[PDB]
Amino acid sequence: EFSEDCENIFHDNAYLLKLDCEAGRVDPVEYDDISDEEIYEITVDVGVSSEDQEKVAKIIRECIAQVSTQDCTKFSEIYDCYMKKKICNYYPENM
């Protein structure tokens, strides 16, 4: 699908964070929320439409809020929410 690149990138980040979290490099409780600046940076700054930003924005916040898991598996669970919500359909094919 058209979506594989976005998906792979989110997949990669999740996995990296997981590995780092395992390594005791990251703390899963800092991932309990997210700023508007981070959001812009992973939406518009990378090809999400201005018009669509809030729509992606909502999925990210819902997902983050929905994941009350606070171990290293949080990173992977959040990614699961993002795929479940089809977040990648809002991004361009190449990125």
Numbering used by the authors: 1 to 95
The authors write:
Immunization with DNA plasmid coding for the salivary protein SALO (formerly known as LJM19) was shown to protect hamsters against the fatal outcome of visceral leishmaniasis and this protection was correlated with the induction of a Th1 cellular immune response. SALO is ~80% helical, has no appreciable structural similarities to any human protein, and has limited structural similarity in the C-terminus to members of insect odorant binding proteins.
Recombinant SALO was expressed as a soluble secreted protein using Pichia pastoris, rSALO(P), with yields of 1g/L and >99% purity as assessed by SEC-MALS and SDS-PAGE. The structure of rSALO(P) was solved by S-SAD at Cu-Kalpha to 1.94 Å and refined to Rfactor 17%. SALO has three predicted human CD4+ T cell epitopes on surface exposed helices. Unlike its native counterpart, rSALO(P) does not inhibit the classical pathway of complement; however, antibodies to rSALO(P) inhibit the anti-complement activity of sand fly salivary gland homogenate. Immunization with rSALO(P) produces a delayed type hypersensitivity response in C57BL/6 mice, suggesting rSALO(P) lacked anti-complement activity but retained its immunogenicity.
